[PDB]
Structures are given as structure tokens and as C-alpha cells.
Amino acid sequence: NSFSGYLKLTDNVYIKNADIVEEAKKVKPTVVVNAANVYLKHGGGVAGALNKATNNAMQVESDDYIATNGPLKVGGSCVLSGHNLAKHCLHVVGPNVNKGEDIQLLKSAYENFNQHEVLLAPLLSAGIFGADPIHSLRVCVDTVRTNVYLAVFDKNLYDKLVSSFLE
Ligand SMILES: Cn1ncc(-c2cc3c(N[C@H](c4ccc5c(n4)OCCO5)C(C)(C)C)ncnc3[nH]2)c1C#N
């Protein structure tokens, strides 16, 4: 858990302008969070990037999990192998408000982080999932009680998030 160059926002939330994949390779965290969908199909965005960094091992394991257990619920999660990126990957489904899912489920989504003492994570429901990223950061800060290190791979968004937190 050798996190470096983060800005501490609260006693348990840290943030950095970084690619979560590159962070996972450097840090070797105990848990990396995947911004997943309910069928664990890592087809693009940050899920596709984490899967590609495992040379598709994450996708094969995910397909096997879905066959036995069925899909996740929106707001839910599962723990699978971290492969070469972490000890464990916590696959979390935030709501996709661009597809009509309820933004209130973002609190349920961040509540999954509280089962793990230290996590490397992306900003849930942001990007093409359509949530307001400032609102996602506020829900993270108000919900997560364990130690979370947020990697946001966009300097423009990072600066807007920090300037909002510090108002
Ligand atoms: C080809 N490639 N290599 C690396 C990455 C990469 C993306 C990425 C990231 N994306 C954030 C995010 C966060 C929650 C998302 C989402 N995206 O997409 C819908 C699902 O929910 C965002 C957009 C807000 C900055 N955040 C952190 N590290 C990251 N690495 C990619 C891609 N794509």
C-alpha cells in the first residue's frame, strides 16, 4: 500500500490525478476497485483497462463467477482475485444514470468499500455512467469510513474536484 503523491481531503479520503491501472502496478494495493456493470463484462473504460492489464484473466474469472452466482445488483459488489494488480479486486456497480438507474444507489455502491480497510478506487458512476462527479466525491466522503485512495485519470476533472472540496 505504498501510495505516493496523493492529496489528503479528509482523515480517510485521498485523491490523485492518475490512471488507476498505473497506480495498481506501482502500489500493489491489497484491494483495487473496478467500476463494473452487473454482468461483469469489462468492455471499455476503466473496467476494460484493468482487464487488459491482467491479459484477460479478470474477464475469464468474472464469466465463471456470473455463471455460478448470477449478475450483481446495481449498488452491489463481489470480491474476486486482484491478479497482477492487487491481492483482491472489489467489483462495484454504481448506477448508470445515463441508462435510467437511480442516483440514490450511489450511496449503496460506496458502502461496499467499508468492508475493506484500504482501497485504491475510481470515482463511481462518473464518466459515461452520467453522475455529476462532484456529487460522487461528496457521497464518497460522507459514506466511506475506511481508507480510500481515489485515482482520477483526468487533470481537468481532478482540479475541479479539489476546488469543490476546498470551497
Ligand atoms: C484505455 N484506458 N487506460 C486506462 C484507462 C482509465 C480510465 C480511468 C478512469 N476513468 C474514470 C471513470 C470512473 C468511473 C467510471 C468510468 N470512468 O467509466 C464508466 C464506469 O464508471 C473517469 C472517466 C471519470 C476519469 N479513472 C481512473 N483511472 C482510469 N484509467 C483507460 C480508459 N478508458
Count of Cβ atoms closer than 10 Å to residue 53 Cβ:
20
Technique behind the model = X-ray
**In order of start, what are the domains of the chain with their CATH numbers?**
1-165 (3.40.220.10)
As a residue count, the chain comes to 167
In the sheet where 31-35 sits, what is the strand order? 7-8, 13-17, 147-152, 118-121, 31-35, 88-92, 77-81
- Residue 120 grid coordinates: 485504491
Give residues (CB < 6 A) around ligand 1: 19-21, 35, 45-46, 49, 122-123, 126-129, 151-154, 157
42 and 34 Cβ atoms separated by less than 8 Å: yes
Q: CA–CA separation, 2 vs 14, rounded Å?
A: 13
H helix or E strand, kind and range, residue 147: strand 147-152
- Residue 68 grid coordinates: 455460478
- Angstrom distances, CA of residue 112 to CA of 7, 9, 76, 84, 97: 23, 20, 7, 22, 19
Location of C-alpha cell 456497480? 93
Give distance in angstroms: CA of 46 to centre of ligand 1.
Answer: 4
What was the resolution (in A) of this experimentally determined structure?
A: 1.2
Q: Torsion angle, CA of 151/156/157/159, rounded to 10 degrees?
A: 80
